[PDB]
Design a protein around this ligand. Structure first.
Ligand SMILES: COc1ccc(C(F)(F)F)cc1-c1ccc(CN)cc1Cl
Length: 327
């Protein structure tokens, strides 16, 4: 069968911490008062929740209320526990309260308010300097949650709120986050298609924090090359083929051979043979202002098939790409 794998970092964090830390099922939720909050406007709705701008009428502060849907309701303890464990961490969204929505009869998570700049404005106007600055801010959040034994598993632009006016960033939506336990087999049906790591696409279940580093690399590649999304698969199978047209099929075969993974035979009719492409191939006059030898070298070290070979968040923070960023 497949060869087991374990993270090269933070392998023991959930061992060194008491069971109360990671055993979310045993966690008792201390409910607040739903009447403290007045809903102002609906901000959006996803697969698992409906998000609203609200006012905490007790202290007159702006908040965000996330009313979980019934499907999300079963796994709320995991999200709550993770949010409470990470509260106060750098660039981690702050959970302010947990109440029971009167109408939905489900839990509603109350967060600090962040004024998020629209995607278009950020995607189209962030400078090379801003990209390095915000990438470093995301790395602070990822090294914090990884060091705390948690993998986000849904790193993508929709889950990164940026208040550009105040140069403030928060990593949000911890609904898909999990505690990392060495040897544990995890559901591969996590992350949005374009951000899914090769481990998910080849059905390798014993993955870890490094999945977040692949997703981060996908966001960086799209941003610096002006190619949104970078790996534009039509489905989960074509997703791996799009990756292979860049990274090459030889390193993909070395990866699955290392972990004794068998590719799904449906790949025989679509994968083909592809050489590894040099990152300079994606450079052109419309993205040259965002590219540098340091950016390409950084990207190269995140976007690797072998989840054990990618830079960790802490190593990534040491990279020359961030030398220009004011610390
Ligand atoms: C492809 O998206 C990104 C890619 C890289 C970066 C960063 F390098 F600056 F950190 C930010 C975004 C982004 C992150 C979040 C949003 C809006 N929620 C918008 C954008 Cl453009």
């Amino acid at each position: 069968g497949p060869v087991p794998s374990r993270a090269r970092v933070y392998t023991d964090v959930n061992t060194h911490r008491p069971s109360e830390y990671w055993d979310y099922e045993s966690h008792v939720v201390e409910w607040g008062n739903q009447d403290d909050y007045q809903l102002v406007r609906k901000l959006g709705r996803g697969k698992y929740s409906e998000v609203f701008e609200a006012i905490n009428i007790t202290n007159n502060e702006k908040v965000v209320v996330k009313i979980l849907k019934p499907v999300a309701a079963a796994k709320i303890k995991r999200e709550i526990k993770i949010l409470e464990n990470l509260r106060g961490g750098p660039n981690i969204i702050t959970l302010a309260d947990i109440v029971k929505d009167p109408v939905s009869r489900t839990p509603a998570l109350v967060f600090e308010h962040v004024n998020n700049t629209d995607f278009k404005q950020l995607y189209q106007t962030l400078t090379d300097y801003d990209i390095r600055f915000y990438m470093y801010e995301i790395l602070k959040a990822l090294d914090y949650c990884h060091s705390m034994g948690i993998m986000h598993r849904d790193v993508k632009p929709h889950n990164v709120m940026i208040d550009h006016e105040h140069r403030k960033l928060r990593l949000i939506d911890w609904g898909l986050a999990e505690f990392y336990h060495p040897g544990q087999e995890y559901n591969v049906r996590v992350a949005s298609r374009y951000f899914k790591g090769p481990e998910l696409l080849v059905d390798y279940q014993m993955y870890d924090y490094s999945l977040d580093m692949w997703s981060l690399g996908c966001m960086l590649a799209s941003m610096i090359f002006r190619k949104e999304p970078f790996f534009h698969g039509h489905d989960n199978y074509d997703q791996l083929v799009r990756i292979a047209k860049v990274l090459g099929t030889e390193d993909l075969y070395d990866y699955i051979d290392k972990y004794n993974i068998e590719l799904d035979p449906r790949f025989n009719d679509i994968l083909g043979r592809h050489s590894r492409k040099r990152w300079e191939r994606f450079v052109h006059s419309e993205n040259q202002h965002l590219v540098s030898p340091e950016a390409l070298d950084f990207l190269d070290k995140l976007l690797r098939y072998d989840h054990q070979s990618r830079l960790t968040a802490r190593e990534a923070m040491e990279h020359p790409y961030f030398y220009t960023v004011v610390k």
